[PDB]
Amino acid sequence: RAHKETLDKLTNAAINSINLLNTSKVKYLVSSAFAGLYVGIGILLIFTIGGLLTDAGSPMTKIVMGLSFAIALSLVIMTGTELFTGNNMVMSAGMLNKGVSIKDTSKIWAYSWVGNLIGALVLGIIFVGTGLVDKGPVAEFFANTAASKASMPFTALFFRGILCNILVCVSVLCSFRTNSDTAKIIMIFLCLFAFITSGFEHSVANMTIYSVSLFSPTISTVTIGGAIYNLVAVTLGNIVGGALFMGLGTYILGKEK
Amino acid sequence: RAHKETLDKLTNAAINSINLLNTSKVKYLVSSAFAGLYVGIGILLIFTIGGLLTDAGSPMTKIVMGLSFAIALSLVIMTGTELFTGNNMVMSAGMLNKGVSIKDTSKIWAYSWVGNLIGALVLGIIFVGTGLVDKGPVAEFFANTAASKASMPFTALFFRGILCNILVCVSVLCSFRTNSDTAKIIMIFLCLFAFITSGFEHSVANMTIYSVSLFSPTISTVTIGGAIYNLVAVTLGNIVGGALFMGLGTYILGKEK
Amino acid sequence: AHKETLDKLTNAAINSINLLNTSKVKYLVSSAFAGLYVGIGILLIFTIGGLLTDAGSPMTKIVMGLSFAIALSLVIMTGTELFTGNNMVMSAGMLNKGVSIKDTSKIWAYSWVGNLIGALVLGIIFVGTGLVDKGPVAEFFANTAASKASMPFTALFFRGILCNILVCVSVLCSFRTNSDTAKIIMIFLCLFAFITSGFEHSVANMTIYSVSLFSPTISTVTIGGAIYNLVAVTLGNIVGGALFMGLGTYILGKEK
Amino acid sequence: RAHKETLDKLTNAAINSINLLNTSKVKYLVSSAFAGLYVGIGILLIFTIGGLLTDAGSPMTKIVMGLSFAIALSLVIMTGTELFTGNNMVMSAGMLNKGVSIKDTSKIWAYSWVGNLIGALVLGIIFVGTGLVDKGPVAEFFANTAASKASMPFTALFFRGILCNILVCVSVLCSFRTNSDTAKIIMIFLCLFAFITSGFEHSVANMTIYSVSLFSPTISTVTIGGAIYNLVAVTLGNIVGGALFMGLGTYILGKEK
Amino acid sequence: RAHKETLDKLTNAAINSINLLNTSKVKYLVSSAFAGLYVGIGILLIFTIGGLLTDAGSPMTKIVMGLSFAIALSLVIMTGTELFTGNNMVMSAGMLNKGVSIKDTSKIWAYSWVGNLIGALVLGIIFVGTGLVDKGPVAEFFANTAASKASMPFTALFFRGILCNILVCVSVLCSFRTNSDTAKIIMIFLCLFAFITSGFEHSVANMTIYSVSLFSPTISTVTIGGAIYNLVAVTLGNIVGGALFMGLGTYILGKEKLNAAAENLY
Numbered sequence A, B, D: 001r002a003h004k005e006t007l008d009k010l011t012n013a014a015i016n017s018i019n020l021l022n023t024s025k026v027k028y029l030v031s032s033a034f035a036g037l038y039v040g041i042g043i044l045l046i047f048t049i050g051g052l053l054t055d056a057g058s059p060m061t062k063i064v065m066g067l068s069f070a071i072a073l074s075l076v077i078m079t080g081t082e083l084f085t086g087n088n089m090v091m092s093a094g095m096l097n098k099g100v101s102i103k104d105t106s107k108i109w110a111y112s113w114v115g116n117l118i119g120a121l122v123l124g125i126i127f128v129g130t131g132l133v134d135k136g137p138v139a140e141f142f143a144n145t146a147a148s149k150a151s152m153p154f155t156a157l158f159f160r161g162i163l164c165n166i167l168v169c170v171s172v173l174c175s176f177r178t179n180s181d182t183a184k185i186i187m188i189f190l191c192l193f194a195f196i197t198s199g200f201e202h203s204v205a206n207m208t209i210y211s212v213s214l215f216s217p218t219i220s221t222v223t224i225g226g227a228i229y230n231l232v233a234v235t236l237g238n239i240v241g242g243a244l245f246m247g248l249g250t251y252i253l254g255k256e257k
Numbered sequence C: 001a002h003k004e005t006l007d008k009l010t011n012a013a014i015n016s017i018n019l020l021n022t023s024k025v026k027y028l029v030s031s032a033f034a035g036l037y038v039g040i041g042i043l044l045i046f047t048i049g050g051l052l053t054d055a056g057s058p059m060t061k062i063v064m065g066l067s068f069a070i071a072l073s074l075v076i077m078t079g080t081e082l083f084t085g086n087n088m089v090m091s092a093g094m095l096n097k098g099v100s101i102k103d104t105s106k107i108w109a110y111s112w113v114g115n116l117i118g119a120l121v122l123g124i125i126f127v128g129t130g131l132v133d134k135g136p137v138a139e140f141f142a143n144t145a146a147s148k149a150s151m152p153f154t155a156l157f158f159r160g161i162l163c164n165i166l167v168c169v170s171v172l173c174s175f176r177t178n179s180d181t182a183k184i185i186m187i188f189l190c191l192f193a194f195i196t197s198g199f200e201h202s203v204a205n206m207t208i209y210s211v212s213l214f215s216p217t218i219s220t221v222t223i224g225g226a227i228y229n230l231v232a233v234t235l236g237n238i239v240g241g242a243l244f245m246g247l248g249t250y251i252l253g254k255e256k
Numbered sequence E: 001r002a003h004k005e006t007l008d009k010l011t012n013a014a015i016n017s018i019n020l021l022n023t024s025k026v027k028y029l030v031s032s033a034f035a036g037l038y039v040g041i042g043i044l045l046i047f048t049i050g051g052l053l054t055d056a057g058s059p060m061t062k063i064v065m066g067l068s069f070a071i072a073l074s075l076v077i078m079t080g081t082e083l084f085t086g087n088n089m090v091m092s093a094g095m096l097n098k099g100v101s102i103k104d105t106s107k108i109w110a111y112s113w114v115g116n117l118i119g120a121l122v123l124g125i126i127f128v129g130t131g132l133v134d135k136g137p138v139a140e141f142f143a144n145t146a147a148s149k150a151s152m153p154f155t156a157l158f159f160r161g162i163l164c165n166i167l168v169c170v171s172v173l174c175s176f177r178t179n180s181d182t183a184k185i186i187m188i189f190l191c192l193f194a195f196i197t198s199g200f201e202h203s204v205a206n207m208t209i210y211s212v213s214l215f216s217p218t219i220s221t222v223t224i225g226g227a228i229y230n231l232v233a234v235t236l237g238n239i240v241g242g243a244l245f246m247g248l249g250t251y252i253l254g255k256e257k258l259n260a261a262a263e264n265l266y
């Protein structure tokens, strides 16, 4: 039971993050851009899988996709780059613990969110240039998924955003609670398996879904307005999951009061 | 063999548990709520898998479910949160070893059970909010499974509860006997694989099964009375498995006379 | 590091007899746990056997093998007393003069009986679940028990030999590594090999027969059949664990 | 984050590579040759798989290929041999951090490329000598893939080269950021799964694809020209991903300014 | 790097190996017998899989077989027993580094080879005793495979031996380069997956294939003549892959070329 020690670590991570931004916006945005790109790589992989298996009428499609998404957050954690969603639990916890302020928190959130988007846009442009979404089941999978994500009612997206960032943030929490990098990766694998296959919504992964779909000439299904709609609802849910549940929760567990 | 060392660890853990509760009810309940919700996350995943594969008439359904449940107790162990079924072995061993009283034991059992339920209820509510059990295979898998669990004879449920918590508690026992976080997860993975696929009954997991089934307007195959009937029977079996077998068993192995 | 490994087996054999001498209750409880833990693996893979056989899957025996790891993993990770592993440990320690032949047949008899008690307890409770009342799982239990009891002695014996080479070698590996993950992986590999290849394990068979005989579901087994298989497989296990692994590890580690 | 220490490790690794070359061309070229062959060994495996599953009409072909390619970079990393692609991030980061010169960088790039090719040629010759590509589904998978890679448009190969080496190099980046050899291998497995299954292009791996196809008398439709066309386009893409993204990126993250 | 330390370890191993053989021929042959039998255990498993999936017309057959062969070298490495094929790299490297002599080498190679063969025969004899190859797809898989290996052209068998032992030895090489036992097993799992599925030939493993078939009663369609053929070709291949490639390779990488006390790099 190292709840106190854990809260200390979260607090210290929150302090490191705002310090980094204060020290250098370039370093912070480059870090954020890597993470958004790393997450997008997971999307490129499982949407390829989605296309191959959906085309095949496989009933295992969504299961194989969940099993195969682990690389997204594994890369972020193993490279120590800045990810908006995890920042929800970290900043909220550290703020509550008086290590950082409400101002530092909204700042980290806004920069990391925008920086992650930069990575998704860059990934989308390059992926399109591969010609891999020119035509076929993979392009179709992007188009249909982007459309479904954009036409889904707000309430549903929001709540899917909550459960998603509970899983993402708890996998980040595990990485703070162990010294085994392998166990970190395993826990990340399990959590991303759970959230992808269950149907939960991640704001940063979705950036790449819309990035690819919008930059691609072969895909005329969704528009920027749709992307913004989905992203706003999912981002708000992510925040509630990561800050209101995980952040507030771990503070309460760890706060020597 | 380290049987004494293990008993000392169990005894320490029991003491630390009752101290947390005595120190702060809010912390204890928040911790319990977390565990309940983490276990529930496993149910959402494997029930999604259930619906998917059952609809397709796959023979692998229950095997894939068992293989995919690991996250449930993996999250509990890696976050160090209070789980009722695990507390059955810990408090019991510690009690026999005079580390904690009978009253402490009943108190810890009652609070964790309720806290676990709070987490299940919350998860259930939010999950229904996702729209993910609005219609289709997953909703039907929840409704049908909840029903078959609620109509099964008491004796059958009881004994399934015994075998389940032997497995859950032995997976917890293993984590007290290794310093390797990966080995803990692996053993947890194996144990949950065994108890899910074999057909054994877990009270805290069942909490989420019924919270979803009752909170969802598209699920009316069961009633509160049914959920209560199952929970009582299964809880009773869980307790026997955890305290009578694992608790007393580990006490006997490690008690220097 | 053969020498140090022999030392480890010798100390383990010494610890076993000392435990039995100090407390029969503790030794039999430990034994009962191991038998139950192994039985748990049988409950899992026979559930799988039922499900996949019913479906005419060619992968049935391959999935059973991959899924049996929990059986010896639980034993190893809980530090409980398993008969089959004891065949190598005691024989090695015996040849090394850490324990006597008398100690060895005493440990072998007590762990065997204690393993059985675990199997019986498990069978009874598992039948109580109603999980083998009817269906392909109950049928897989009945059919497997029946085929194992009717098989010729010589076949069971040699299948018992190869099974315990694999089981005891996985135990040997656990003495040669400080990594718990490595132990479990080798156990996984070895049980995969012995289940899927079709070798026979006495202790696991105990649960096969306690379940089949405790279940009112009609089979062609009988107690005479169970005892037959158990005797044939146990002797086989003993040769493979004692004559091969026990003797071999002693020869490798003995400074002579 | 340990960005400074990471950049420091990259720089020392770059310094060590040029040192080795300057000390002994034979040593460096033997190391390079090993890496090229180790990578080629991955190709023999997944192209055997590709053949078997292609001939079966399995929709899982590319998924199984991706999952089975881990050995390629795992061997390189575990043997500490010189691989051209990974050298793109390492020499560029080290060069930006003023540990090695631009000349050292293009020297290491030229020598490791040629060394890698020699391994691929040695492997290709020996493989053909086994008679495994005399005829059949594996021979045809080598023949057809070599052709489709040689006839693909430059821009598509280029961008696929970029994304491939971001994945290879980030997997190399991870090996620099953990002391766990198991975690190194898991991350390599993930990154190679992602790049293979997604369809990205790797220059060194293609060397073996073309050595096998060209050395094989089992008639096909490639030619040295087509091989040169593909290798040039993919190599340039690899360089951009490894140097311009990963090298520059990690340099900015860890630079003391 | 760290090739120099690795070369030291290979040299020390070759030394320990010849010391043991000189200390006790009984201890060395028992070790070699274990290793041969551990490898064969892998064959019994994956050949059972062969039969089961071949008879079902599965396309995943050779993939599942490759994935399932890891136990063979995993047991050898984890038990620290003497396996002929690994000895090709070890002895050759140590020899080049002047830790052991050409005579020392050929003696280890000869004794380990024979020791491994003993384990296979003993394993084959016991396996047939199970009746598991009395009749059916598994018995047939052994028969058919033993035939094809015995009736394959020499050059092909030779080159398949080379690539096999490159893969077997590089996995042994990885075990010298890591302190993580789990990573050792994983790398072994990968290399044996690759070598089995790709279709390369391992001499020691083939000792059990022919052992089972020549001790098996249900027909032959083979002949010891075939076994000797295969075993001879594959063995020379193994030695080349292990000694010429991996042995010489690691030496070159790790020999600090100050010394030079004899030869010059460039």
Ligand SMILES: CCCCCCCCO[C@@H]1O[C@H](CO)[C@@H](O)[C@H](O)[C@H]1O
Residues within 6 Å of the ligand: A106, A107, A110, A111, A114
């Ligand atoms: C490529 C350039 C990216 C620029 C992103 C800047 C996002 C600014 O975001 C704003 O930052 C303020 C502090 O400056 C905070 O007070 C606000 O809460 C926040 O919205």
Ligand SMILES: CCCCCCCCO[C@@H]1O[C@H](CO)[C@@H](O)[C@H](O)[C@H]1O
Residues within 6 Å of the ligand: A117, A121, A207, A210, A211, A214, A215, A216, A217, A223, A224, A227, A228
């Ligand atoms: C975070 C959401 C991703 C925003 C990426 C916007 C990139 C838009 O990209 C543009 O989209 C237009 C239509 O939408 C197309 O007509 C253009 O061809 C395309 O370049």
Ligand SMILES: CCCCCCCCO[C@@H]1O[C@H](CO)[C@@H](O)[C@H](O)[C@H]1O
Residues within 6 Å of the ligand: B103, B106, B107, B110, B111, B114
């Ligand atoms: C949401 C608030 C949850 C409070 C749960 C408290 C229920 C306590 O319940 C009782 O606790 C006693 C000790 O206090 C035990 O002795 C009794 O066995 C138990 O029934």
Ligand SMILES: CCCCCCCCO[C@@H]1O[C@H](CO)[C@@H](O)[C@H](O)[C@H]1O
Residues within 6 Å of the ligand: A180, A182, A183, B179, B180, B181, B182, B183, C179, C181, C182, D182, E180, E181, E182, E183
């Ligand atoms: C895909 C599942 C494979 C899991 C492989 C587990 C590899 C973990 O590796 C193990 O990690 C431990 C940390 O707990 C360390 O103590 C051990 O030294 C190390 O071998």
Ligand SMILES: CCCCCCCCO[C@@H]1O[C@H](CO)[C@@H](O)[C@H](O)[C@H]1O
Residues within 6 Å of the ligand: B117, B207, B210, B211, B214, B215, B224, B227
């Ligand atoms: C421990 C078992 C969980 C009990 C939670 C009961 C919450 C019930 O909740 C109610 O369920 C009714 C039907 O069941 C619905 O008609 C109502 O809309 C809903 O509010």
Ligand SMILES: CCCCCCCCO[C@@H]1O[C@H](CO)[C@@H](O)[C@H](O)[C@H]1O
Residues within 6 Å of the ligand: C028, C102, C105, C106, C109, C110, C113
């Ligand atoms: C639940 C009761 C089970 C008790 C099992 C006791 C079996 C004793 O077994 C016997 O023990 C003797 C020494 O006591 C040895 O000399 C014999 O070799 C051994 O067969």
Ligand SMILES: CCCCCCCCO[C@@H]1O[C@H](CO)[C@@H](O)[C@H](O)[C@H]1O
Residues within 6 Å of the ligand: D106, D107, D110, D111, D114
């Ligand atoms: C047998 C294989 C020998 C290969 C030696 C390659 C020598 C490469 O040499 C390098 O080439 C670079 C461009 O190619 C130049 O930029 C460098 O100045 C030059 O040193």
